[PDB]
Amino acid sequence: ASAAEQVNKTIIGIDPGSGIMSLTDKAMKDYDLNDWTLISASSAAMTATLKKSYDRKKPIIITGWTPHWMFSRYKLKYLDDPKQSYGSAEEIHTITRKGFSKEQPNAAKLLSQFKWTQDEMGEIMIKVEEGEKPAKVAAEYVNKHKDQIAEWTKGVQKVKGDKINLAYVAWDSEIASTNVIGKVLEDLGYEVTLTQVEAGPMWTAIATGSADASLSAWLPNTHKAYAAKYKGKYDDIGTSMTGVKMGLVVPQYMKNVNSIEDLKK
């Protein structure tokens, strides 16, 4: 039976303002999936549905990305994207309000040097998903990764309670990044605020300056329209991760579903 029959031509998505959802809308146009439906939801509802479907070995298609804990807990695959609708060579960037590195060159320089791998981010995501509190897990991380933190803080000095406001979107990945770097800041002496906001407001907050920095930029593909819209109005000072991926994801037990093209059948 055909992917469209298996899932009733429905794809499970996340928050409507995210670029993955925008990129999935493009792919549906690109591959002529014109009678298909994309359900808007959220990160937590998407994985709850995946879990419910997977536990019953029922077919599902989700808007998925890596780094994500769901790939270590379940056997998943990306559908081949021959048209490259989701693009290529995606990274995760560290952005700030414009001229933030002129005010607090010490904080900027740290953010600039923050980087890490998928497996590493995953250590945090797994525990957070298991119900542990992200500040607590972030503490465990920074102790356990002594050699790494040192790399981040090469040339970085303590402080006297200097305020820094980190905006972030509650994707599982960005929860981890923000909390980890959150900790490394609070140890350096900063008074740290974390402001949760949705995807567009996150960018609007950096570009207007209602927040200082964010670890939540996925570039150049995922957040292309937000970057374009606010070109000139923020600084891009870091790449925390490369090789990251986004697209349509299915459980491996859907053996006959392997490409977005299979959804046309």
Ligand X SMILES: C[As+](C)(C)CC(=O)[O-]
Considering beta carbons, is residue 23 or 188 the nearer one to ligand X?
23
The answer to whether residue 20 forms part of the interface with ligand X (CB under 6 A) is yes
- Nearest approach in angstroms of CB 17 to ligand X is 8
The answer to whether 231 touches 219, Cβ cutoff 8 Å, is no
Q: Cβ(125)–Cβ(68) under 8 Å?
A: yes
Residue 173 interacts with ligand X (CB under 6 A)? yes
| Residue 199 lies near ligand X (rule: CB under 6 A) | yes
The size of the interface with ligand X (CB under 6 A), counted in residues, is: 13
Per-residue DSSP letter, 122: H
**Least distance from C-beta 77 to ligand X, angstroms?**
17
**What is the spatial distance between Cα 43 and Cα 121, in angstroms, rounded to a whole number?**
17
**Which window, 16-24, 125-133, 151-159, 182-190, contacts ligand X (CB under 6 A)?**
16-24
Verify binding: residue 218, ligand X, rule CB under 6 A.
yes
The yes or no reply on residue 246 touching ligand X (CB under 6 A) is yes
Q: Burial, 47: exposed, middle or buried (Cβ in 10 Å; 0-12, 13-18, 19+)?
A: buried
Q: Which lies closer to ligand X via its Cβ, residue 174 or residue 235?
A: 174
**Helix intervals (H) in the chain:** 3-7, 19-30, 43-55, 70-73, 100-103, 105-113, 118-129, 134-144, 146-152, 172-188, 199-208, 224-229
Our finding on whether 19 is near ligand X (CB under 6 A) is: yes
Please give the residue ranges that form the binding site for ligand X (CB under 6 A).
Answer: 14, 18-20, 65, 171, 173-174, 199, 218, 222-223, 246
